[PDB]
Amino acid sequence: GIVLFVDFDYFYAQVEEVLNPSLKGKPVVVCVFSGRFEDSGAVATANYEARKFGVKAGIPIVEAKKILPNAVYLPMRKEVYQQVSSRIMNLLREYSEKIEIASIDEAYLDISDKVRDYREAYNLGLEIKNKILEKEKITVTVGISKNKVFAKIAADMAKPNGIKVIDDEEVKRLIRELDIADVPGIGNITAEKLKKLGINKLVDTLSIEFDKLKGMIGEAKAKYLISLARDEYNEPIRTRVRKSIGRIVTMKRNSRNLEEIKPYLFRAIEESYYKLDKRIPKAIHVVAVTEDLDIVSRGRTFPHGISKETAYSESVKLLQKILEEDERKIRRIGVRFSKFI
DNA sequence: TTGGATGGTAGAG
DNA sequence: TAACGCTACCATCCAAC
Ligand SMILES: Cc1cn([C@H]2C[C@H](O)[C@@H](COP(=O)(O)OP(=O)(O)OP(=O)(O)O)O2)c(=O)[nH]c1=O
Ligand SMILES: *Nc1ccc2c(c1)Cc1ccccc1-2
Ligand SMILES: [Ca+2]
Ligand SMILES: [Ca+2]
Ligand SMILES: [Ca+2]
């Protein structure tokens, strides 16, 4: 069982550095500007130079500019990053047929039949890094271990431009020593609940009553953590199948005017339908983000596919439903399609 | 004598 | 002053031959 994981370094920011080499080695911040006012929106990512000053994914641009006014702030050019991603993902395909594309910049390869051992796996990781750097001038981090979770943890430890093997002995050390927060899938909310059960390390999960852990974090996550801690997790590398395709836009001003909201919604539908690429959806959900950033959605599922024209009229009724059942003003509006034929 | 649809939550982007 | 995107999972529920 040998899994090689690839995660591209500071991805959007690094693509902008390849396009404009004068950027390299100084703070670069990639932003989602939203329209609302001067510099409204959020950071998508930033290069490591900018991160030293606290700028990173998620924070508002106005806050980034407070702690790092000097940097290059660039509008996110998603189309260009997807082009670069697709070419790299096709390079990776050449090293293994068992590949799992996990995100715009992540893929797992099952190389159990390609290499005899970790030493050979490591050499293959360098070949992959070299090839990607040659073809795309993009640095990446490679993580290598016995399963997906530890391969991803290996890349986290080695980031940026790194390569790391976590061998059987180091897996045992991490079960003992790794802060549970740093386990994939364990976020702030789950971690804090675990903090209450005395669980700080993966190994702590072995001594706890299974139903107290279940009653706290739910069946799936409890099973997940115990399996990892047991050194048994062995989930297969499988092709990811798109389940939903959606778009959400920020309105210039908050509104409850249907006619004022509709153009944004239709734009979201038009854009969603372009990305569907031959897929035919049987479900549609409208999403409204209210003034206080609560997320509200209403959907409808048909026994048959939804035509683009049908989506327009159905989305209107879903938005009328939200507007009738929630009095708060809408700030963001979007649509999602799912249950593809 | 359990299940698809429903809307909300949490997080490996 | 807080984007954009998408999966897995969770409760809840109104239907159950
Ligand atoms: C986390 C995050 C990522 N992204 C996008 C931009 C990132 O470049 C891309 C990949 O996500 P990540 O791999 O999480 O981040 P990264 O590649 O920018 O940085 P790192 O070196 O630490 O791996 O996805 C967002 O748009 N918003 C986000 O909140
Ligand atoms: N990024 C993003 C885009 C569209 C949608 C979400 C996120 C959540 C959601 C829920 C219902 C419909 C559409 C969307
Ligand atoms: Ca990355
Ligand atoms: Ca990533
Ligand atoms: Ca975490």
Could you write out the DSSP letters of every residue in A10-39?
A: THHHHHHHHH-GGGTTS-EEEEEE-SSSTT
Ligand 5 centroid–CA A187 distance in Å is 4
Compute the distance between CA of residue A325 and CA of residue A206 in angstroms, rounded to an integer: 46
Q: How many CB atoms lie within 10 A of CB A97?
A: 12
Nearest nucleotide (CA of A103 to C1') = B13
> Which amino acid, A182?
D
> Which amino acid, A172?
K
**A18 CA to centre of own chain:** 22
Domain residue extents for chain A: 2-10+78-166, 11-77, 167-233, 244-336
Question: Does residue A286 contact residue A333 with C-beta atoms inside 8 Å?
Answer: yes
Identify the residues numbered 248 to 277 in chain A whose C-beta atom is closer than 7 Å to any atom of strand C. Answer: 248-250, 275
**HSE value, Cβ hemisphere, 13 Å, CA-based, for A109:** 24
Nearest nucleotide (CA of A35 to C1') = C3
Sheet containing strand A72-75, strands side by side: A41-46, A28-33, A72-75
Tokens 């919604």 identify what position? A265
Question: Does residue A67 contact residue A53 with C-beta atoms inside 8 Å?
Answer: yes
| Token reading at A180 | 């549970």
| Residues near A317 by beta carbon (within 8 Å), at least 6 away in sequence | A300
| Token reading at A239 | 């092709």
A167-233 has which fold?
DNA polymerase; domain 1 (1.10.150)
Nearest residue CA, atom 19 of ligand 1? A10
Compute the distance between CA of residue A24 and CA of residue A14 in angstroms, rounded to an integer: 8
| Residues near A307 by beta carbon (within 8 Å), at least 6 away in sequence | none
Phi/psi class of residue A160: alpha, beta or left (left: φ > 0; alpha: ψ in -120 to 50)?
beta
The residue among A119, A102, A31, A105 whose CA lies nearest residue A72 is A31
Which protein residues have a CB closer than 5 Å to ligand 3 (ion)?
Answer: A 7-8, 11, 105
The residue among A94, A99, A151, A97 whose CA lies nearest residue A121 is A151
Compute the distance between CA of residue A47 and CA of residue A25 in angstroms, rounded to an integer: 9
Please report which ligand is nearest the Cα atom of A248: 2
| Token reading at A223 | 């099973």
CA distances from A195 to A74, A172, A185, A333, A336 (A): 39, 21, 16, 36, 36
SS3 A281: strand
A140-145 and A281-290: which strand pairing?
Answer: unpaired
At the fourth CATH level, which superfamily is domain A244-336? DNA polymerase, Y-family, little finger domain (3.30.1490.100)
SS3 A72: strand
Q: How was this structure determined?
A: X-ray
First CA to last CA distance, chain A: 34
| Token reading at A341 | 């034929």
Tokens 């802060």 identify what position? A179
A11-77 domain in CATH 3.30.750.24? no
A2-10+78-166 domain in CATH 3.30.70.270? yes
Identify the residues numbered 211 to 270 in chain A whose C-beta atom is closer than 7 Å to any atom of strand B. Answer: none
Compute the distance between CA of residue A264 and CA of residue A245 in angstroms, rounded to an integer: 17
CA distances from A216 to A49, A158, A205, A206, A257 (A): 40, 32, 12, 15, 42
Nucleotide C4 C1' to residue A198 CA (A): 36
What are the E-state strand segments in A9-127? 28-33, 41-46, 72-75, 99-103, 106-110
CA distances from A47 to A37, A77, A102 (A): 25, 15, 21
SS3 A53: coil
Ligand 2 centroid–CA A318 distance in Å is 14
DSSP letter string over A289-324? EETT--EEEEEEE-SS---HHHHHHHHHHHHHHHHH
With distances taken from each CA to the C1' atom of nucleotide C7, the closest residue turns out to be A243
**HSE value, Cβ hemisphere, 13 Å, CA-based, for A143:** 25
Compute the distance between CA of residue A104 and CA of residue A15 in angstroms, rounded to an integer: 13
SS3 A74: strand
Check whether A113 is labelled as a binding-site residue: no
Ligand 5 centroid–CA A181 distance in Å is 4
| Token reading at A313 | 């009229």
Compute the distance between CA of residue A42 and CA of residue A22 in angstroms, rounded to an integer: 24
Query: Residue A203 class from Cβ within 10 Å (0-12 exposed, 13-18 middle, 19+ buried)?
Result: middle
| Token reading at A307 | 């035509």
Question: Does residue A42 contact residue A32 with C-beta atoms inside 8 Å?
Answer: yes
| Residues near A112 by beta carbon (within 8 Å), at least 6 away in sequence | A1, A2, A3
Q: Is the dihedral of CA A113, A116, A118, A124 positive or negative?
A: negative
The residue among A22, A25, A40, A33 whose CA lies nearest residue A78 is A33
Question: Does residue A228 contact residue A183 with C-beta atoms inside 8 Å?
Answer: yes
DSSP letter string over A130-166? HHHHHHH---EEEEEESSHHHHHHHHHHH-SS-EEE-
Cis previous bond, A75, omega within 30: no
> Which amino acid, A258?
L
| Residues near A274 by beta carbon (within 8 Å), at least 6 away in sequence | none
A54 touches strand B (CB under 7 A): no
A140-145 and A106-110: which strand pairing?
Answer: unpaired
A18 touches strand C (CB under 7 A): no
A281-290 and A330-340: which strand pairing?
Answer: antiparallel
Nucleotide B9 C1' to residue A131 CA (A): 40
Check whether A9 is labelled as a binding-site residue: no
- Catalytic (active-site) positions of A: 106
